[PDB]
Ligand binder design. Structure first.
Ligand SMILES: Nc1nc2c(ncn2[C@@H]2O[C@H](COP(=O)(O)OP(=O)(O)O)[C@@H](O)[C@H]2O)c(=O)[nH]1
Ligand SMILES: [Mg+2]
Ligand SMILES: [Mg+2]
Length: 255
């Protein structure tokens, strides 16, 4: 078989289960994530000679490391075997989905944005510009509906097209300001010789923000301890910048 492994990421209640079901039908099964009792759901479908293995991640509002659901989702995204990620966004209620998307884009993984429930969005009379989304996010964007079937085949096409690509299309460089960017550069330089399994920019962001995993690992690697005030301060600056970018994307792409 010609296998493509795809993770479905998204906030709770965005339409992940429905999209999963629409794509896999009855070809799905459940188990547990390793070492925990938390359920893992996987499914399969075939498209143009390819076999797509879909894995639904726990719903996550953000990708921190202070709850088992975020630990499972983020561990998989960072350390798992997905060839690409579909970020399932609620088209009617996009803001938190887009925030989560930015976090994942900084991991430098292949991501397709699936704006689902597009049939519901239409009814509200809202106008969503797919071109503006692709421009501001730098990734493929597909409008989908699990009710009407809109976009489902286009999504399958983009999955297989994107999986074949040698690199990621996107490259999400959000300017966090002089002071944060300076510390990022210093951290990257400090770790230049380390064999990190994730890009140094993302690592630096999480370390500076006092992430339970990355801050601890950073210190083990020789980075200095940071005061609680600095960790909170960086975490806040970074989140605030992400939120303002989301707000701008929404202003530009939604009407
Ligand atoms: N109209 C419409 N409703 C949807 C669509 N996808 C999901 N929903 C509804 O959104 C709600 C949450 O969907 P679900 O798939 O369970 O979301 P999950 O919590 O992310 O797995 C349910 O009421 C679904 O019926 C869609 O494409 N169109
Ligand atoms: Mg749900
Ligand atoms: Mg909804």
């Amino acid at each position: 078989l010609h296998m493509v492994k795809v993770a479905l990421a998204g906030c709770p209640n965005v339409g992940k289960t429905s999209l999963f079901n629409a794509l896999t039908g009855t070809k799905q099964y459940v188990a547990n994530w390793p070492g925990v009792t938390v359920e893992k759901k996987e499914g399969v479908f075939t498209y143009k000679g390819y076999t797509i293995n879909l894995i639904d991640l726990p719903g996550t509002y953000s990708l921190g490391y202070s709850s088992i659901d975020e630990k499972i989702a983020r561990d998989y995204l960072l350390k798992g075997d997905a060839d690409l990620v579909i970020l399932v966004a609620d088209s009617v209620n996009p803001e938190q989905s887009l925030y989560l998307l930015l976090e994942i884009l900084e991991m430098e993984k292949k991501v397709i944005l699936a704006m689902t429930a597009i049939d519901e969005a239409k009814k509200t009379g809202m106008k969503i510009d797919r071109y503006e989304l692709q421009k501001h996010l730098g990734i493929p964007v597909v409008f989908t509906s699990s009710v009407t079937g809109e976009g489902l085949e286009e999504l399958k096409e983009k999955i297989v097209e994107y999986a074949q690509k040698n690199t990621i299309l996107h490259r999400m460089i959000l300017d966090y300001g002089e002071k944060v960017e300076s510390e990022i550069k210093k951290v990257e330089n400090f770790l230049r010789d380390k064999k990190l399994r994730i890009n140094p920019r993302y690592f630096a962001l999480k370390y500076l923000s006092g992430d339970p995993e990355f801050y601890s690992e950073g210190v083990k690697l020789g980075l200095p301890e940071l005061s609680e005030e600095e960790r909170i301060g960086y975490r806040l600056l970074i989140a605030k910048r992400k939120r303002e970018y989301v707000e701008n994307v929404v202003k530009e792409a939604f009407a």
